[PDB]
UniProtKB/Swiss-Prot annotation, chain A:
Gene name linked to the record: ENAH
Lineage, uppermost ranks: Eukaryota, Metazoa, Chordata, Craniata, Vertebrata
Domain remark text: The EVH2 domain is comprised of 3 regions. Block A is a thymosin-like domain required for G-actin binding. The KLKR motif within this block is essential for the G-actin binding and for actin polymerization. Block B is required for F-actin binding and subcellular location, and Block C for tetramerization.
Family: Belongs to the Ena/VASP family.
Protein name (Swiss-Prot/TrEMBL): Protein enabled homolog
Extra facts: Required to transform actin polymerization into active movement for the propulsive force of Listeria monocytogenes.
Length: 110, 7
């Protein structure tokens, strides 16, 4: 079904617009392993992240064609869809580079 | 896009 095209260490955040604050995705602070999964049958991509500790899925987001991926800093990247704003606070610049490369590749071939 | 988080 789906192939992982990258793995990156990041704390996954979502933006609480009513309170103007970032909050941990899934409700629990800490780092996750964040994949981009490619579904080859229909050429779709998804961001799926799981907490290192307890394997909880904290993000499971489609990547639509035309997404604006904002590399705010070398270690915090973010994007939005029609409901939520997502942020990734990467564990290193290398993790940020790996993930942005895969994301940019996804956006090119979509 | 919102500013990046803090400590």
């Amino acid at each position: 079904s789906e192939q992982s095209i990258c793995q990156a260490r990041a704390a996954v955040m979502v933006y609480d617009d009513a309170n103007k604050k970032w909050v941990p995705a899934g409700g629990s602070t800490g780092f996750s392993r964040v994949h981009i999964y490619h579904h080859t049958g229909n050429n779709t991509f998804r961001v799926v992240g799981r907490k290192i500790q307890d394997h909880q899925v904290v993000i499971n987001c489609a990547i639509p064609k035309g997404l604006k991926y904002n590399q705010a800093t070398q270690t915090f990247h973010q994007w939005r869809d029609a409901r939520q704003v997502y942020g990734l606070n990467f564990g290193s610049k290398e993790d940020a580079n790996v993930f942005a490369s895969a994301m940019m590749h996804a956006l090119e071939v979509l | 896009x919102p500013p990046p988080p803090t400590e």
